[PDB]
Structure formats: C-alpha cells, structure tokens
Amino acid sequence: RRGSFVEMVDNLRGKSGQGYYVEMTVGSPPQTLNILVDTGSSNFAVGAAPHPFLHRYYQRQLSSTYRDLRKGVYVPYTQGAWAGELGTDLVSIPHGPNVTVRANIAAITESDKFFINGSNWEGILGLAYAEIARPDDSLEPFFDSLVKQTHVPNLFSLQLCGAVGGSMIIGGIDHSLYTGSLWYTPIRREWYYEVIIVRVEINGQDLKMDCKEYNYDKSIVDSGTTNLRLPKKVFEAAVKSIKAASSTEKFPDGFWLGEQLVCWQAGTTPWNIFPVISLYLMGEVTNQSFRITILPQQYLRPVEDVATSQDDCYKFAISQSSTGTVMGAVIMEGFYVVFDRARKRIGFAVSACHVHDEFRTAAVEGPFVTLDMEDCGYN
Ligand SMILES: COCCN(C[C@H]1C[C@@H]1C)c1cc(-c2nnc([C@](C)(N)Cc3ccccc3)o2)c(Cl)c(N(C)S(C)(=O)=O)n1
C-alpha cells in the first residue's frame, strides 16, 4: 500500500513500439542521457557521436572520471548492431537507487539500424547476465557492478504501461504497482532471462503442441523487444487458432504476418471479438504452474497515429523467431514483472496500469497441476 520506493515510480517513458527508457547520469561533471531498459542484452552502451536520430550523446573528453579501456566492442542484435570503444565512468540513476558506481560503458561511435527516430533514447542498458555480454563474459554488466559495489538488493522490477511511461523499481518491489498476488517462475539459466512455458491456450483452448516446441532453443523475457515472438511451428498454430477464434470479422492474411494494418474509427475497435491468450509458466513447486493471460489490447498495438485522426490503426504484435520464444514489451505491459535475481526467479502480477475493459482483464492465475514440466526445456 505505502511506498518507500515512491521516488522511483514513473521513472520510465516510452512505449512498446519504440522502447521504454530511464534517465542515467554519467561522468563528471554530470551528463544525463535517456537509456533504453533492455532485459534482452547485457551491455551498457551510449551513443557518443552525433547521429540524425539522437538529440544528445556522451562526450567522453568532458568527463574527468572517464577511463578508456583501449579496446573496441561490436554488438549485433536480432535487430541492429553497433560498434564502440570500451571504458568505465561514474554512473548514477537520478530516479533510481541513491548510489553511484563505476561501470563499464561502451561509447557507440558507429551503428546500423539500431537507434530509432523519435524514440527519444540515446543508449541501452543491458540488464541480462554476463554470459551474453560482448566481447565476452569478463565485461561485468551494469547491474552486477551495482550489486557488488553497493548494498542495493539484487533485484529490480518493471511496470511497463501502454496506451505512456512506466516504473523501474531497483532494489525492491513497490506494492502500489500491482494488485493480487505475485507468481514466480524460475530463471532456468543465467544468461538471458530464460523461462519455461509449459502450456498455451487460446480462449481457453489448449494449442495442444508438445511443450518442447514452446521453448525450442529458449524462451526469454525481453523488455527491449516489442512483440511476442514465437518459433515458426508455434507461430503458425497460434495464428490458426486466433483466426478461428476471431471469425466474426475477416482480416487479410497479411495482417497476421505484420504486412498489413487494420484501422477502426476512433473508439470502435471490437476487442470482444478477439481471443485472450494464456501462457502457462513453470512454477516454484514440483508439478505446479500458473498462467498469465494476455488481452487483444496487448497483442494488437497502435501504430503511431497519423495525426489525431478518426482512425486507430493496429499491427499484429505476434511474430516469428528462429531463436526461440521472446516475451516482449506488449506481453509485459499487462503486468508488474519482478526480476528477482537474488532468488533466480521472475514474478508476474496484474499491473496497476493494466489496460483492460468492462468485459475482460489481464490476469495472473494459479496454481495449476502440470506434470513433466522439466521435459519442456531444450538441452
Ligand atoms: C522499431 O523497431 C521495432 C521494435 N524493436 C525495437 C525495440 C525498442 C522497442 C521495444 C525491436 C527490437 C528487436 C530486438 N532485437 N534485439 C533486441 C534487444 C536485445 N532488445 C536490443 C535492441 C535492438 C534494437 C533496438 C532496441 C533494443 O531487440 C526485435 Cl527482434 C524486434 N522485432 C523484429 S519485433 C517487431 O519485436 O518482432 N523489434
């Protein structure tokens, strides 16, 4: 109810389509920049040279505390890539924990399809583990430096709100950001924030696929990816089921492939005709699972409105991946997500800013009995 972490509430801005970012102050004297909150990577990097899409950038020569590591780094993602120079400098988060640490920082000098026009962020905060850091796992990630250099508890939580901001609570949980109970799923391995999906239902109907397919390769939570990305075989089955459940109105095939958009008169989108999606996650007790339910308001995302027109355009936010399942921002938006690194688990609870209607609401429910969940993981 109360809020000891009140000063961290609403410290995020942005949206699912372009990313959620937090202010971070680097160097001395202070240089504050807007940084993308990214749980799908582990490198802390900031644009360090002028770029058409950047309003500001890190000026290392002006920072007396900057230490050049004399080594370059190249980081490619599923989307975009950048090259920069490695170094370290003092870093603080104005609206985050009351601490200052010396962290590794990559100064981005060149990039390709990474920065996004109009996103308003100039850097990225990789919050995942050292195993996937570049050049290698010896480059300590920011959060690891934070936990080793201070007494801030090894945990952070994210409340991403869609429609235009959110909250990143560092060091704890803020009870005003969620309702009901928090349900935890184990972090299977500490590299990406890997989880295990044991069952998938579309409008209460089991997709009936071998659960190994749901996590083929891996299933991760990435606040820096827009969509719910699914392995080809799973994507096809889910789309066929979703299409059948929303047969009231016919949509072109390209819509389900993100090739076509569909717009409705302002305030007329028939949410009720679209099904809810339930993803069951492995629980903390043997043979016990829980599920998070996703509404169409989540998987149908508004595409940057033309200019206050009488039409709301939407893009299907479920797509395919060849590298496993990715639970992106549209999935996280309906919930308060706790990245409990200390106890190697991720918690989900109904968000205090969950976008629902008078008929249905996003939810987190349990417990359910699910046998042989261990066998759902890929080895
Ligand atoms: C406008 O571009 C489309 C949306 N966007 C940008 C994300 C910022 C918004 C959340 C984005 C980022 C990545 C993606 N790949 N790898 C990552 C990291 C590891 N999070 C790093 C990162 C790279 C580039 C920008 C921001 C962060 O993200 C991916 Cl697969 C996709 N898809 C293809 S999608 C539309 O979601 O199916 N889209």
Domain definitions of the chain by residue range: 20-152, 153-379
- Residue nearest atom 25 in ligand 1 by C-alpha distance: 114
Give catalytic status of residue 68 as yes or no: no
305 part of the active site: no
Whether 227 lines ligand 1, by a CB cut-off of 6 Å, is yes
The encoded tokens of residue 331 equal: 């999935």
- The Cα–Cα gap between 351 and 150 comes to 29
Ligand 1 proximity of 80 Cβ (cutoff 6 Å): yes
Do the domains spanning 20-152 and 153-379 agree at the CATH topology level? yes
Would you say how long the chain is, in residues? 379
283 vs 281: CA distance, rounded Å: 6
Q: Where do the DSSP E strands lie in 224-362? A: 228-231, 262-265, 277-282, 288-294, 300-302, 311-316, 318-321, 325-327, 335-340, 345-351
| CB 299 within 8 Å of CB 238 | no
| CATH class of the domain comprising 153-379 | mainly beta
3-state secondary structure of 49: coil
Amino acid at position 360, single letter: R
Bridge partners, residue 126, by sequence: 38
Given the residues 38, 89, 144, 174, the one annotated as active site: 38
Q: How far is the CA of 116 from the centre of ligand 1 (A)?
A: 10
CA dihedral of 222, 200, 177, 333, whole degrees rounded to 10: 50
CA–centroid distance, 215 to ligand 1, in Å, is 20
Is the domain covering 20-152 a CATH 3.40.50.720 domain?
Answer: no
Experimental method: X-ray
Cα of 204 to ligand 1 centre, how many Å? 30
